[PDB]
Scaffold this motif. Sequence first.
Motif, PDB file in Angstrom:
ATOM      1  N   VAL A   1       0.803  -1.217   0.000  1.00 13.63           N
ATOM      2  CA  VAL A   1       0.000   0.000   0.000  1.00 13.63           C
ATOM      3  C   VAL A   1       0.845   1.282   0.000  1.00 13.63           C
ATOM      4  CG1 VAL A   1      -1.862   1.237   1.148  1.00 13.63           C
ATOM      5  CG2 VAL A   1      -1.671  -1.248   1.410  1.00 13.63           C
ATOM      6  N   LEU A   2       0.438   2.255  -0.808  1.00 16.83           N
ATOM      7  CA  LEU A   2       1.111   3.545  -0.878  1.00 16.83           C
ATOM      8  C   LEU A   2       0.088   4.661  -0.694  1.00 16.83           C
ATOM      9  CD1 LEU A   2       3.379   5.554  -1.471  1.00 16.83           C
ATOM     10  CD2 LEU A   2       2.803   5.318  -3.882  1.00 16.83           C
ATOM     11  N   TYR A   3       0.332   5.515   0.288  1.00 15.58           N
ATOM     12  CA  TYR A   3      -0.542   6.640   0.552  1.00 15.58           C
ATOM     13  C   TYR A   3       0.401   7.819   0.653  1.00 15.58           C
ATOM     14  CZ  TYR A   3      -3.745   9.898   2.897  1.00 15.58           C
ATOM     15  OH  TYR A   3      -4.510  11.003   3.206  1.00 15.58           O
TER      16      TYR A   3
ATOM     17  N   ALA B   1      -4.802  20.427  -7.467  1.00 15.93           N
ATOM     18  CA  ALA B   1      -3.963  21.521  -7.929  1.00 15.93           C
ATOM     19  C   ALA B   1      -2.614  21.343  -7.220  1.00 15.93           C
ATOM     20  CB  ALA B   1      -4.590  22.853  -7.557  1.00 15.93           C
ATOM     21  N   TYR B   2      -1.587  20.999  -7.989  1.00 12.43           N
ATOM     22  CA  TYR B   2      -0.246  20.769  -7.450  1.00 12.43           C
ATOM     23  C   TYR B   2       0.327  21.929  -6.650  1.00 12.43           C
ATOM     24  CZ  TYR B   2       0.539  16.334 -10.011  1.00 12.43           C
ATOM     25  OH  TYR B   2       0.489  15.031 -10.482  1.00 12.43           O
ATOM     26  N   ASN B   3       0.137  23.151  -7.137  1.00 12.59           N
ATOM     27  CA  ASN B   3       0.687  24.307  -6.440  1.00 12.59           C
ATOM     28  C   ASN B   3      -0.299  25.056  -5.545  1.00 12.59           C
ATOM     29  OD1 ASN B   3      -0.475  25.247  -9.011  1.00 12.59           O
ATOM     30  ND2 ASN B   3       0.423  27.240  -8.496  1.00 12.59           N
TER      31      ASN B   3
ATOM     32  N   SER C   1      -4.677  14.437 -12.200  1.00 10.69           N
ATOM     33  CA  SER C   1      -5.046  13.329 -11.322  1.00 10.69           C
ATOM     34  C   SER C   1      -3.937  13.099 -10.312  1.00 10.69           C
ATOM     35  CB  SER C   1      -5.265  12.034 -12.113  1.00 10.69           C
ATOM     36  OG  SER C   1      -5.653  10.967 -11.251  1.00 10.69           O
ATOM     37  N   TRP C   2      -4.326  12.923  -9.059  1.00  7.65           N
ATOM     38  CA  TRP C   2      -3.355  12.705  -8.002  1.00  7.65           C
ATOM     39  C   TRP C   2      -2.857  11.258  -7.981  1.00  7.65           C
ATOM     40  CZ3 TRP C   2      -0.069  15.506  -5.841  1.00  7.65           C
ATOM     41  CH2 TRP C   2       0.509  15.199  -4.597  1.00  7.65           C
ATOM     42  N   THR C   3      -3.772  10.297  -8.084  1.00  8.84           N
ATOM     43  CA  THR C   3      -3.365   8.897  -8.027  1.00  8.84           C
ATOM     44  C   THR C   3      -3.512   8.068  -9.299  1.00  8.84           C
ATOM     45  OG1 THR C   3      -5.494   7.999  -7.321  1.00  8.84           O
ATOM     46  CG2 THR C   3      -4.037   8.923  -5.619  1.00  8.84           C
TER      47      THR C   3
ATOM     48  N   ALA D   1       3.755   7.764 -15.589  1.00 10.19           N
ATOM     49  CA  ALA D   1       3.705   9.211 -15.816  1.00 10.19           C
ATOM     50  C   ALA D   1       2.299   9.728 -15.519  1.00 10.19           C
ATOM     51  CB  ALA D   1       4.072   9.524 -17.254  1.00 10.19           C
ATOM     52  N   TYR D   2       2.199  10.960 -15.020  1.00  7.81           N
ATOM     53  CA  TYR D   2       0.906  11.565 -14.700  1.00  7.81           C
ATOM     54  C   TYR D   2       0.686  12.816 -15.534  1.00  7.81           C
ATOM     55  CZ  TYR D   2       1.261   8.415 -10.731  1.00  7.81           C
ATOM     56  OH  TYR D   2       1.411   7.290  -9.954  1.00  7.81           O
ATOM     57  N   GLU D   3      -0.494  12.943 -16.130  1.00  5.96           N
ATOM     58  CA  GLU D   3      -0.776  14.103 -16.962  1.00  5.96           C
ATOM     59  C   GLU D   3      -1.320  15.251 -16.131  1.00  5.96           C
ATOM     60  OE1 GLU D   3      -3.293  12.973 -20.294  1.00  5.96           O
ATOM     61  OE2 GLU D   3      -1.714  11.672 -21.081  1.00  5.96           O
TER      62      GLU D   3
HETATM   63  N1  LIG Z   1       0.191  12.333  -9.115  1.00  2.41           N
HETATM   64  C1  LIG Z   1       1.204  12.468  -8.341  1.00  2.41           C
HETATM   65  N2  LIG Z   1       1.778  13.697  -7.964  1.00  2.41           N
HETATM   66  C2  LIG Z   1       2.914  13.459  -7.081  1.00  2.41           C
HETATM   67  C3  LIG Z   1       3.001  11.928  -6.937  1.00  2.41           C
HETATM   68  N3  LIG Z   1       1.904  11.381  -7.746  1.00  2.41           N
HETATM   69  C4  LIG Z   1       1.646   9.925  -7.882  1.00  2.41           C
HETATM   70  C5  LIG Z   1       0.928   9.147  -6.770  1.00  2.41           C
HETATM   71  C6  LIG Z   1       0.901   7.721  -6.815  1.00  2.41           C
HETATM   72  C7  LIG Z   1       0.239   6.983  -5.804  1.00  2.41           C
HETATM   73  C8  LIG Z   1      -0.388   7.701  -4.760  1.00  2.41           C
HETATM   74 CL1  LIG Z   1      -1.218   6.821  -3.493  1.00  2.41          CL
HETATM   75  N4  LIG Z   1      -0.355   9.056  -4.729  1.00  2.41           N
HETATM   76  C9  LIG Z   1       0.267   9.783  -5.677  1.00  2.41           C
END
Ligand SMILES: N=C1NCCN1Cc1ccc(Cl)nc1
Lengths: 206, 206, 206, 207, 206
Positions: free
Chosen positions: B112-114, C89-91, C143-145, C192-194
């Motif tokens: 798990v990664l948070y 929002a990253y920043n 997207s964060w995750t 990679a994240y867009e």
């Molecule tokens: N989308 C981003 N921005 C910084 C890191 N990351 C990837 C990410 C991958 C997995 C989890 Cl649980 N949270 C974030």
Amino acid sequence: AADRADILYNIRQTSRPDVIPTQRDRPVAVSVSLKFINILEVNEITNEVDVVFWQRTTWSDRTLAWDSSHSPDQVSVPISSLWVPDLAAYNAISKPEVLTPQLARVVSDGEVLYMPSIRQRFSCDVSGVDTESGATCRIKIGSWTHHSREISVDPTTENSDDSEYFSQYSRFEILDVTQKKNSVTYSCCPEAYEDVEVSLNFRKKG
Amino acid sequence: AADRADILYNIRQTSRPDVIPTQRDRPVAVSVSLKFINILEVNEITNEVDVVFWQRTTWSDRTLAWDSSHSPDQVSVPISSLWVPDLAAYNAISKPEVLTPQLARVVSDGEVLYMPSIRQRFSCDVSGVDTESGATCRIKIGSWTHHSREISVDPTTENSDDSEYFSQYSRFEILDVTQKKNSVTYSCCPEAYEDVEVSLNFRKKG
Amino acid sequence: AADRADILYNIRQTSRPDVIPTQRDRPVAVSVSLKFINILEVNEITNEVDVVFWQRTTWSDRTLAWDSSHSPDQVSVPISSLWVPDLAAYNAISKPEVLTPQLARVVSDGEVLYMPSIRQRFSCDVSGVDTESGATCRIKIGSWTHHSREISVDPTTENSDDSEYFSQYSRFEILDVTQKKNSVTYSCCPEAYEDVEVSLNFRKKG
Amino acid sequence: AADRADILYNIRQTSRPDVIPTQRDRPVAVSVSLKFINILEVNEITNEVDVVFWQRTTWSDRTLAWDSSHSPDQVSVPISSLWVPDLAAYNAISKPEVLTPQLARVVSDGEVLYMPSIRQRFSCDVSGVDTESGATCRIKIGSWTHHSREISVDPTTENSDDSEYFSQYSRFEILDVTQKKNSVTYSCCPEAYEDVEVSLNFRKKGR
Amino acid sequence: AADRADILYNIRQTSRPDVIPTQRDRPVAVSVSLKFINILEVNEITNEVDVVFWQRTTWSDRTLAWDSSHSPDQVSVPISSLWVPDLAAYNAISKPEVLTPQLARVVSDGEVLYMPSIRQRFSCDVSGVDTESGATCRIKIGSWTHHSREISVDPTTENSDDSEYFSQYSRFEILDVTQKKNSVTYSCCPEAYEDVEVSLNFRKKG
Ligand SMILES: N=C1NCCN1Cc1ccc(Cl)nc1
Ligand SMILES: N=C1NCCN1Cc1ccc(Cl)nc1
Ligand SMILES: N=C1NCCN1Cc1ccc(Cl)nc1
Ligand SMILES: N=C1NCCN1Cc1ccc(Cl)nc1
Ligand SMILES: N=C1NCCN1Cc1ccc(Cl)nc1
């Protein structure tokens, strides 16, 4: 031979968060003792202060006891699953800000420990915070709705270093901390309510 | 031959959010690593700072494992559906402000990664922030209620630039970041609690 | 023959808020667009700004689709009953303060539209805000995750003046707005994240 | 034979939080009185004050009664498990900040007491706060949606010391506190609404 | 033979908080009118103002009706048990701070009245607040996701003194209040969304 999962499951089935765990007609003995961590914003003109402290709270609750002959004898449980004493600080002028995970530790014998680190603002005597003798801010904490026959409160026997956990980086330093139990009857109400008064003697560094 | 829907559903059927997933009688190994994103408010007079950081957190939970031979081997899951370590920053003076969706990433084998981005205020050494050497603010993080035999925390020796994601518009800059692991027995309590100390050496730009 | 009640009830029973609606092996295509409404408190000293904008967000969830040949074509739905991209929002240095009812619009084909009005504080380049050329604040949302193979984000454009909905009573004015698309790979993680990057060229009003 | 667990479960099973417990066709008689704890912020320029007070509130709900011959005749109950009057301070300019555990005391005869300590900001007359006769801030509290035929409000005879619970460390001091009832018909609405107006006479102390 | 408990019971069965109660294929007619209670934090420099106001809102919902031949013809109901129009203040720069219990009044014929007292900050024309003619602050309110064919908003031109409820202790005074209905088609979307603009003419006292 049950695991933690079973110990948690039996706690939710038997535990009644809304029900004070009195024994017969005896009051639930609650121990309250504060461990100051920081003093953040004092104001001598308004007699207000911002404190951060651990609120060590312990009591017994039989309805939680379990047989740990061949299983974990202690677990972390969310307070929403347990009855917790309804403590309040009489001279606090803001809701307590609970900074830590709201989990308590429950022992197989029913002993419960709940020690949240709280940041809260109080109305107290800040006169002299800028002197050698310093200022003494008294904080009173007791059950809000349970009078003396249902809940009794007393300062823990423990007496660690007043500032054994206090921040060395604060603009203030702790001169001394004394605790004192009380039993008071207010004109509003017929019963007596117990409280523990904690006196914080501190001063600005220099 | 399941899909993401089944993967999530199953997790809801075996996951025990309030049960620490210990294997045998061993502690759950949690890795903690901070990636600083910004330093917003510094006060040398009060020794208080405002920081934004990603709290990369990893641990294992076998109760979440599934056969990904004929399905995805990774999915985003709300943390409310998972057990998560009860970490807390000892010298924090504000509750953490989670700036990102509270979702964890669960891999088929249970990993798990948070990694929430957090804005929080701390009490630490800000002296020297305006010098060339800068100030060194230490942030202590560890399990609030799980002792060393239940949860162990260790720094993630990930190789990367400290200011890799640090904002170029902050009034401050990062000189160096080091992470050490500690284990401490406090007078308050019988068992020992682990923590990771992150040392942030920063200064105002010239 | 169905009414809104039937449609909304069906949507709640079939829509899975914690399951990304990926189709086949392709990513959910998410469109993002910002329409600035106000600039409330800019600080050139700290490179911090407070903005109010509409975040037009659209995507498909074909499972929601229904035969509307004999019933309503669209329905407003609470986002908690729907899966929504975990955008961040990253920043941003504060959580989004959503000013409008958190309802999305679902079209019978499965198209989803969510346009909340949001006030949020960011860390960006504010230098030159008092000049004729003004400052250029860049906001990064993605997207964060969910990585590039689960979620895609692309800028949407409207053939309308960037200041068509901007507050005439704001102390600032919009000079221009551009939106680029990116695919960043962070050392933290393999995929990679867009992200969509929106540049806001504004300045204090003469 | 009944214990607290039985009572609390029964209360939670019979109590209807969204149903005003009117008996027959009479209004629920609610009593309201304030016990001032502190005066934290005062602005004579804006006529705004920040006060802390115990809002003592009592009323009856006969359906909650239970035979306490062989059991406890009083228990603390979370208010979320009870119907409570929708009282509101008409001139308040901030949502009430409840400082204490949100628990009420329910007696075996159905009498209910809810007394939260609240910090709240008000819009009232602050002129003269530095004079000898001080300022007189009037706080108006009454049911927000129940008219006089559903809820009636009366002041409790708090014939005690007004500063009995007042902080000795406040920059201000209380000179006097009076309470009076009113029954008002606004042009917005056909029915009359009752309220209690608490008059707080206070002033800044001298060095 | 029915009492309030019965009435509330029927309502929390037939009522669908997520379903707009349109009659046939006609829009839900919603009346909106603000009763100003106070004007608190005026800032002519930033064109921002803090206003307190009762937001009288009425509409019909037949799905709530009930035979009141031998039962109460009105009850107070939590809005969480009812559909409520999704109104939003376009130029508000903060979420509405609802100061009063969130209860609506429902009549036996299905007429609903919801009138919370709200404190909210707006971005509007504050210039002239210190003159005799005063400043004119325009507040725009309408459905966020329901277009003209689903929700229509009309002002209630009732002859009620603009200051009946206004606080005599405010630093400001109300000169006049006017209303105007509109119908807008935002570039983002095809349909037209109705709104009511309430113009507040006020000035500093003396
Ligand atoms: N989308 C981003 N921005 C910084 C890191 N990351 C990837 C990410 C991958 C997995 C989890 Cl649980 N949270 C974030
Ligand atoms: N803790 C105390 N001591 C005197 C008054 N009081 C507070 C209190 C007591 C009972 C209820 Cl229902 N509510 C609040
Ligand atoms: N994490 C630590 N180390 C010393 C004290 N403490 C906090 C703590 C431990 C146990 C419970 Cl129930 N609550 C809070
Ligand atoms: N308490 C009073 N008196 C006049 C208006 N009002 C408030 C009120 C009355 C009814 C509804 Cl549904 N909402 C708010
Ligand atoms: N009422 C307004 N103001 C701006 C856009 N809009 C209409 C609208 C349409 C659909 C959705 Cl999901 N949200 C808002």
